[PDB]
Each structure stands twice: as C-alpha cells, then as structure tokens.
C-alpha cells in the first residue's frame, strides 16, 4: 500500500501518506486555515508503544471472577486471551449482571470524547448493545458545561452553551471591545467534537486586523493574550462573580446601566438589586469589596464597567469558571451583567459562550444535517424501571457517589431520586481514570464494581484498571462519514480507511455486534447492514434533505470518490444571537416561564437549594486562593491541555515536547518557586489532603502569583495500587481535585476548585510505567 488517503479527526481534516501499508505522515487539509500541531501525535497514536495489541483479562478476575481481590486493579497483571474467549466472557458477564441485578446493575454512561464518525460512534454503539441486553444506567450532562448547561435554560430559556454565536464577521464590523472571560480560544479552538474547521482563527485574525480592543480575564497569560497583545486582567481563580458584582454595582452607583433594557427584556432585577446594594446583608457589592476578594484593583473594576457600558462590547466567556463549586453562578451573573449593559441582541454586543469551542461563530452554511447510528432506544419498549430500583440516569460527575451509595437519595435540578445499585461498568471511548475528580476516592469506589470492561486503542490508566480490555481500532483503520464544523456545517467528509487494523484490534462496531450476536440479538444490532451500508444510509438521508432544501448533492459513490461535499453560505455570516428577541420580545419570547431573561428565578426559588439561590449570588466555595481559613496556599489552574485533547496523545511523541524530567509540567511563578527553594526544571511534589502527585516545574511569570498551572489529562501512574494515597508518578491533576457537586441545581463537577502545596520532591526515585504496555500485552 503506497499512496495518499484523506480522512479527519477531532483535530481536523488531513491527508495521510501510506508507504507499504504504514501511515508515515499526516498533512493538513489545504483548506484548513490553522492546522493543529497535534496531528503528528494523532498519527503516532496508531503505532506508539501504548497501542493496545490484544484482548486481555486481568489475571485475578480471569481466575476468580466476582470473588477477585479488586484492590489490585491497575497493577498491570493481565493475561492475553483470544477474541472468542474474551467475547464469550463479556457476553456472559453482561447477561449475568442483567439477569441478576436488572438494567440498574449496569452503568452505560461511558462518558468520553472518543473519535468523530457517524458509524463508529463507540459510546452510542455500546448503548445500542446494552439496550438489546436489557437496558442500563445512563449519564446526563457532561464535564464541560455541567453547571452552565443547566442554569442557562432557567435564565435564558435555552441550552446556550452549544448554540451558534453571533458570526465572527459581524463582530469584526461592529464590536469595539471583545472580552475573553475565562476563555483561551487560541488554545481550545484546535479541536472539534465533529471535524473542526478551525473557523475561530480567521475570526480572531479579523478582530486583530480591525484593531478592536481586546481584554482577557484569566489567571494565566495565555496565547490568546499574546496573540492580541490584550489588556490582561488576572483575577484570583474562583472570584469572577465578585468582580462581575463589583462591575454591576458600579453601573448602578454611577447611574449608567441600561434601565430600559432591564425593564423591557428581564425579569426579577428588582429582587436582585437590594442584594447588590447590600440591603439584605449589610455588604454592598462595591468595586472595593470585589477587590478584597479577587485582588483586581477596585478602580480597574470600575473602569472596565464604564468601558463595557460605553462601547459595543461582546463578553465571550469560557467554561473553566463554571467547572467549579457554585459554577452555576458564573454564567448566570455574566448574563445579568450583560443585561445591565443592554446590548444583548445588537450586532457585536452581548455575550457568547461558545467562541472558544468547536468554531462557535463560524458562519453556518445552508447544508443539511448528518445523523449516524442510534442506540435503538426509540425502537422496542424498554421494560419498567421503578423508582425503588433507583434512577435510570445520573449527572455524569456523580458516578462515584452512585457507586458508594446505592439506594441513597440525590437532588438534581428540582428532582430527588435514588442511586441505582450498579455492579458493572462498561467504558468505551473515555478515560475516567484521568477525567474524574478525586482519584484516590474513585480508586477505592471502583472496588464496588464486580466487573469493569474497557475498549480503547491506547493503554490509558482506565484500560490499565479494567478487568477485561478489548483492543479497539482507531478511525484510521476503518471507513466513516462525518460533518466538518459543529456549527459551520462546512461540508461532509468521507473518513477513509488509511491502514488495515493493527495487531488484533477490532472496531467497536465489530466487537459490539459480536457480543450482541452472542446475546441472541446480532441481527438487531447490525440491522442487516455492513460498514458501507450504514454509511450510505446516513449520506442518502443527508442528500434527501439537501435535495429538498435546494442544496442537491452527488450520489453516494460519486461523493465517496471525491471524498467530501462542501456547502454554500447563504445568510449564515449575518447571524446575530438574540436579535429576534431584542427586535420584538413579545413576538419572539425566550423559553423561560416569563418569556424574559430571568435574573431572579421563581422556579429555582421553589427548589430551596442552599447552594443555588434564586438570583446570582457570591457564595464562598469549598476552598479558594487566600480564602479565610483556606489550608493550602496555591490555586491549581487545572485547565485543558495545549498539546493533548484531554488525555489523548499523552502516550505519543508529543509528550517529549512538554514533559519536565519525564513528568507532566507545572507552571509556577518565580516568587512562589523561590520561596520553596524550587529551581526551573526541578521535580516537585504537588499535594493536598486528597492526594499527591509529581510534576516537573517550569518557572514563569505567565502564571499569576499564587497560581500554578497543571493541565488536566495526565496519565495517572500510581506507584503502588494497593497503597491508599499512593504517589502518582506522572501527574494526573485529578488526584488533587475534590469530587463534589457545583450545587444541587446541576451537580456539575468542580475539577478546577483546587488548592494545593508544592515542595521540591525528596521521596524515593520513580520509574514511569504508564508509557509502555503492561508486560503481558507487549
């Protein structure tokens, strides 16, 4: 096999060079305006030393089954087995758990970023098989906008976080002041949930070319700051709401805010005002009060408030500030501040919660939607699940609380239910042993599972902790179809097979059709179709919709031969979010009970949640930098990796470009380094009451004083899985996070509410074992 093949991924469209059946180079699509350097690691992930070769069974589970000693999961003691033995065993375990415990005994939430592709959607495929097996417990929401996606529907009446933004070109022509609040779009625009078009880069470039004022509010001097030479505001992490309240207070005290916009488009500001003024608690939320909490100068806070009120301003907020205790307050208070500015719905004004994600704001084309295989759920009646058997769904980040407290009650967005009693967890396309908070608690809670099954193509910590590991193929070893552009709908791509499945790896589709076949539902899982039958069915449906919309597309074979279809932009570049509501709120009301922006929410008031009041409120978090009585001195900006997609690509050649002494890097301010005797490049121990990890320090004033940056996604590498609190040799920041809910409203994760201490490491030397396969899988 010596040629070139085009395909796509979460990092973008690309062309692979193949030489005697091996992919040797991934070259970015010629129309990608800003490719990601991570493509080199994508290619490397097909072949790296942590590629999973064969199906494996954890020796203790192979020998003892449910009586296994579960405290040794993760020690790497696996036995290689044949595909037939492993499929029989997985099918027997699914049947056994379903029969013995009901669907409530099987957790199938399997949260994860997987790979794009309408056919090879491993998490949907898992659920298609589990539906056929009798059912399963699902997850609700995600780790990205756990809080924001639940509070927005109460406030603005829509999901908001995953909806199209005012178009980039409308911003270049109308916005005078662009604010990136807790957003680093240069960093996070590299990837897409579906194939990315990188539409933010030309949008950002156009703002810079127009000379538009840009202000970044972030504890770290990011590349977004650098790109624009932006005015950079450095709040102590977790104090943005106090700053917003200080700005709002200033707008009232100086009599500047838009009273008309508040009277005509919002509901409940009159119940928020007294609190803002301090009438209810003797604590006027002044700029000075906000300086006390956040560290940002009171005069800067007022000057920003005045600037935003006097110029067409776009508040482009990111999501790290809601992935925290009381996370709901952040975007609720931002919308409240934006309502006080009165520019929601005007070209270039208001707010936007997706300018830093998957091309939000890239103009949408007139093309049709593309849909892929489904879980079969809307197809034969799932039996009756009664409340006594527990909820059939949990907020995703409550997975460990669930395992630890079967039958216990939990509150979620106005409803109380009981946790189901789960005995089996099946995970594909996700890495919970890296993405979930409080690794030491989670490691212990996993002992409640009888059986844990994982499919991946990389030996992640999650694969290392499974009882049964099945090697999946990458997208580059099969064919698929997918949209380019979560919002732009730039076109549809043929994700063409580049190389044959490596080693004994199999698509998740093939695996699940095999398990389903052993359960007696083979035909039902495949629907009588094969890989191209499924792909052509999705395409044809897309084509039928396009033909009916005046966007006719070629026949399938013709589309597949070209490898792509691109669609025309009609009016998508003119899109202004909230314009129709602004233009006539009686004709175009929002989906809230009042039809208006709810600054005070009667529906939330009725829930009676102490941690989620009925108007945006400054509440003390579990821990925050310089909080009164806080134990630990440094805030960890546990944010998204520049050179990984979460944990993805950790076990590739890219790792050498950022690792420090082989460990995940930790940014630290020179003053904080010097106070601990720490030198740039030193191995340091980062620890709190929940865990301890090793990182390699990079001393830089890019991180504000009091804050260290350790990205999420590091492959957890425990020194000894049987030792509680064991040191993590590589640097998974989730060993240090707490596992608590943003509040009772959303139950989102608080992965960025983290305080810790750092010292030069003086323990025993460490050997990294997470970047090579377990000995028996070699």
Ligand X SMILES: NC1=NC(=O)C2=N[C@H]3C(S)=C(S)[C@@H](COP(=O)(O)OP(=O)(O)OC[C@H]4O[C@@H](n5cnc6c(=O)[nH]c(N)nc65)[C@H](O)[C@@H]4O)O[C@H]3NC2=N1
Binding site residue list: 111-115, 144, 187-188, 217-218, 238-240, 319-320, 323, 431, 435, 455-456, 478, 508, 640-641, 646-648, 734, 751-752
Site size toward ligand X (CB under 6 A) is 61
Minimum CB–partner distance for residue 259 and ligand X (Å): 28
Minimum CB–partner distance for residue 507 and ligand X (Å): 8
Closest CA to 725 of 758, 669, 695, 687: 687
Contact status: 238 vs ligand X (CB under 6 A): yes
339 or 462, CB closer to ligand X? 462
Contact status: 215 vs ligand X (CB under 6 A): no
Strand 451-456 vs strand 468-471: parallel, antiparallel, or unpaired? Answer: parallel
Q: Which residue of 318, 348, 714, 774 would you call a contact of ligand X, by CB under 6 A? A: 318
Minimum CB–partner distance for residue 538 and ligand X (Å): 17
Count Cβ neighbours within 10 Å for each residue of 88-105 and write b for 16 or more, e otherwise.
Answer: ebbbebbbbbbeebbbbb
Closest CA to 214 of 227, 201, 200, 202: 227
Strand partners, 126: none
CB 694 within 8 A of CB 729: yes
Task: Considering only residues 607 through 666, tell me which ones interact with ligand X, judged by CB under 6 A.
Answer: 637-642, 645-648
Q: Is position 609 annotated as part of the catalytic site?
A: no
Contact status: 144 vs ligand X (CB under 6 A): yes
Residue by residue, DSSP assigns 240-278 as HHHHHHHHHHHHHHTT-S-HHHHHHHEE-HHHHHHHHTT
Residues 640 and 341: their CA atoms lie apart, in Å, by 30
Contact status: 428 vs ligand X (CB under 6 A): yes
* Measured torsion, CA atoms of residues 102, 108, 109, 111, in degrees rounded to the nearest 10: 160
Site string for ligand X, 484-523 (x = CB under 6 A): ------------------------x---------------
Residues 308 and 39: their CA atoms lie apart, in Å, by 39
Residues 484 and 195: their CA atoms lie apart, in Å, by 5
Catalytic residue among 113, 257, 618, 716: 113
390 or 501, CB closer to ligand X? 501
Contact status: 122 vs ligand X (CB under 6 A): yes
Residues 618 and 352: their CA atoms lie apart, in Å, by 22
Exposed / middle / buried, residue 255 (Cβ in 10 Å: 0-12, 13-18, 19+):
exposed
- For helices 269-276 and 240-253, what crossing angle results, to 10°? 100
Residues 734 and 711: their CA atoms lie apart, in Å, by 10
CB 231 within 8 A of CB 213: yes
Minimum CB–partner distance for residue 358 and ligand X (Å): 8
696 or 713, CB closer to ligand X? 713
> What own/partner pairs with CB < 8 Å and gap ≥ 24 does 521-524 have?
521/132, 521/133, 524/132, 524/376
Minimum CB–partner distance for residue 551 and ligand X (Å): 29
Minimum CB–partner distance for residue 388 and ligand X (Å): 32
Q: Which residue of 187, 521, 669, 744 would you call a contact of ligand X, by CB under 6 A? A: 187
57 or 68, CB closer to ligand X? 57
Q: How many CA atoms lie within 13 A of 685 on its CB side?
A: 15
Task: For the chain, give the longest Cα–Cα distance.
Answer: 76
480 or 524, CB closer to ligand X? 480
Phi, psi of 334, rounded to the nearest 5 degrees: -65, -40
Stretch that binds ligand X, among 13-21, 212-220, 516-524, 533-541 (CB under 6 A): 212-220
Q: Is position 560 annotated as part of the catalytic site?
A: no
Phi, psi of 84, rounded to the nearest 5 degrees: -65, -40
Q: Which two tokens stand for residue 500?
A: 């044959």
Stretch that binds ligand X, among 101-109, 204-212, 317-325, 552-560 (CB under 6 A): 317-325
Minimum CB–partner distance for residue 454 and ligand X (Å): 8
Residues 474 and 645: their CA atoms lie apart, in Å, by 15
Minimum CB–partner distance for residue 501 and ligand X (Å): 12
Q: Find all residues with CB under 8 Å of 452, minimum gap 6, and list them.
A: 73, 424, 425, 426, 427, 446, 465, 466, 467, 468
572 or 714, CB closer to ligand X? 714
Residue showing tokens 């590349």: 223
Give the DSSP letter of residue 440: H
339 or 752, CB closer to ligand X? 752
Catalytic residue among 11, 54, 111, 289: 111
Residues 680 and 668: their CA atoms lie apart, in Å, by 9
Q: How many CA atoms lie within 13 A of 458 on its CB side?
A: 26
Stretch that binds ligand X, among 256-264, 449-457, 535-543, 671-679 (CB under 6 A): 449-457
Which residue has its beta carbon closest to ligand X?
Answer: 318
Site string for ligand X, 688-717 (x = CB under 6 A): ------------------------xx----
Minimum CB–partner distance for residue 238 and ligand X (Å): 5
Contact status: 352 vs ligand X (CB under 6 A): no
Minimum CB–partner distance for residue 89 and ligand X (Å): 17
456 or 664, CB closer to ligand X? 456
Contact status: 752 vs ligand X (CB under 6 A): yes
Q: Which residue of 14, 29, 107, 113 would you call a contact of ligand X, by CB under 6 A? A: 113
Give the helix ranges, DSSP H, for 342-476: 399-404, 432-435, 439-445, 461-464
Q: Which residue of 124, 389, 431, 753 would you call a contact of ligand X, by CB under 6 A? A: 431
End-to-end CA distance of the chain: 26
Contact status: 398 vs ligand X (CB under 6 A): no
Strand 177-181 vs strand 313-317: parallel, antiparallel, or unpaired? Answer: parallel
Q: Which residue of 441, 455, 521, 577 would you call a contact of ligand X, by CB under 6 A? A: 455
Minimum CB–partner distance for residue 176 and ligand X (Å): 21
Stretch that binds ligand X, among 303-311, 450-458, 561-569, 765-773 (CB under 6 A): 450-458
Contact status: 123 vs ligand X (CB under 6 A): no
CB 315 within 8 A of CB 337: yes
CB 404 within 8 A of CB 411: no
Stretch that binds ligand X, among 97-105, 188-196, 479-487, 539-547 (CB under 6 A): 188-196
Site string for ligand X, 13-52 (x = CB under 6 A): ----------------------------------------
Which residue ranges make up the site for ligand X (CB under 6 A)?
112-115, 120, 122, 143-144, 181-184, 187-188, 190-191, 217-220, 222, 235, 237-238, 240, 318-321, 323, 356-357, 428-431, 435, 455-458, 460, 472, 508, 637-642, 645-648, 712-713, 733-734, 737, 751-752
Q: Which residues are catalytic?
A: 111, 113
């Amino acid at each position: 096999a010596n040629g070139t093949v085009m395909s796509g991924s979460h990092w973008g469209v690309f062309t692979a060079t193949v030489e005697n059946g091996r992919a040797t180079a991934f070259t970015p699509w010629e129309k990608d305006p800003h490719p990601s350097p991570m493509l080199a690691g994508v290619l490397d992930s097909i072949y790296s030393p942590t590629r999973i070769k064969y199906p494996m069974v954890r020796r203790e589970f192979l020998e003892k089954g449910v009586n296994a000693d579960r405290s040794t999961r993760g020690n790497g003691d696996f036995v290689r087995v044949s595909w037939d033995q492993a499929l029989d065993l997985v099918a027997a375990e699914v049947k056994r758990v379903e029969e013995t415990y009901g669907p409530e005994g099987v957790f199938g939430g399997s949260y994860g970023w997987k790979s794009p592709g309408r056919l090879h959607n491993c998490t949907t495929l898992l659920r298609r098989m589990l539906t056929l097996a009798g059912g399963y417990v699902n997850g609700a929401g995600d780790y990205s906008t756990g809080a924001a996606q639940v509070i927005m529907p109460h406030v603005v009446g829509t999901l908001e976080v995953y909806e199209q933004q005012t178009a980039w070109p409308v911003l270049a022509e109308n916005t005078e002041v662009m604010v990136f609040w807790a957003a680093d779009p240069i960093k996070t625009s590299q990837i897409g949930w579906v194939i990315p078009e990188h539409g933010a880069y030309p949008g950002l470039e156009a703002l810079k070319a127009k000379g538009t004022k840009v202000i970044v509010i972030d504890p770290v001097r990011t590349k977004t700051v650098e790109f624009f030479g932006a005015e950079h505001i450095t709040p102590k992490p977790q104090t943005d709401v106090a700053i917003m309240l200080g700005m709002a207070h200033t707008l009232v005290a100086e009599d500047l805010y838009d009273k008309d916009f508040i009277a005509n488009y919002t509901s409940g500001f009159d119940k928020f005002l007294p609190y803002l003024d301090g009438e209810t608690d003797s604590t006027p939320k002044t700029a000075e009060w906000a300086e006390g909490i956040s560290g940002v100068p009171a005069e800067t806070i007022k000057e920003l408030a005045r600037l935003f009120e006097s110029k067409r301003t776009m508040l482009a907020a990111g999501w790290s500030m809601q992935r925290m205790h009381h996370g709901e307050q952040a975007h609720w208070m931002l919308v409240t501040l934006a309502s006080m500015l009165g520019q929601i719905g005007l070209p270039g004004g208001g707010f936007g919660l997706s300018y830093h994600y998957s091309g939000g704001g890239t103009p949408s084309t007139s093309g049709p939607a593309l849909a892929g295989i489904t879980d079969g759920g809307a197809a034969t009646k799932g039996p009756e699940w009664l409340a006594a058997s527990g909820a059939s769904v949990i907020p995703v980040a409550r997975v460990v609380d669930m395992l630890e407290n079967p039958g216990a009650e939990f509150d979620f967005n106005g409803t109380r239910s009981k946790f189901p009693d789960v005995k089996m967890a099946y995970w594909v396309g996700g890495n919970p042993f890296v993405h979930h908070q409080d690794r030491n608690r989670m490691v212990k809670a996993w002992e409640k599972l009888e059986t844990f099954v994982v499919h991946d193509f990389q030996w992640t910590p999650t694969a290392r902790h499974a009882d049964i590991v099945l090697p999946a193929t990458t997208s580059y070893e099969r064919n698929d179809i997918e949209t380019i552009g979560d919002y732009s709908n730039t076109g549809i791509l043929a994700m063409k097979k580049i190389v044959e499945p490596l080693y004994e790896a199999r698509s998740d589709y093939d695996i699940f059709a095999a398990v389903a076949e052993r359960l007696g539902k083979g035909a039902e899982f495949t629907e009588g179709k094969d890989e191209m039958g499924w792909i052509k069915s999705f395409y044809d449906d897309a084509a039928k919709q396009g033909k009916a919309a005046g966007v006719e597309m070629p026949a399938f074979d013709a589309f597949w031969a070209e490898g792509i279809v691109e669609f025309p932009v009609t009016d998508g570049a003119d899109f202004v979010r909230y314009a129709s509501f602004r233009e006539d709120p009686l004709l175009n009301p929002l989906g809230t009970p009042t039809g208006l922006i709810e600054i005070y929410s009667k529906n939330i008031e009725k829930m009676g949640y102490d941690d989620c009041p009925a108007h945006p409120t400054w509440m003390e978090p579990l821990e925050r930098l310089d909080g009164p009585g806080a134990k630990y001195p440094l805030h960890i900006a546990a944010s998204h990796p520049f050179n990984r997609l979460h944990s993805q690509l950790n076990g590739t050649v890219l790792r050498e470009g950022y690792a420090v002494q082989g460990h995940e890097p930790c940014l630290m301010h020179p003053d904080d380094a010097a106070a601990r005797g720490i030198a740039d490049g030193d191995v340091v121990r980062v620890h709190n009451d929940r865990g301890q990890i090793l990182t390699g320090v990079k001393v830089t004033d890019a991180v504000m004083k009091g804050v260290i940056q350790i990205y999420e996604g590091g492959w957890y590498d425990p020194s000894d899985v049987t030792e509680p609190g064991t040191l993590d040799k590589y640097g998974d920041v989730n060993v240090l996070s707490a596992d608590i809910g943003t509040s009772k409203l959303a139950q989102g994760n608080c992965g960025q509410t983290v305080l810790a201490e750092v010292e030069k490491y003086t323990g025993p030397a460490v050997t990294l074992t997470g970047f090579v396969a377990p000995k028996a899988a070699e």
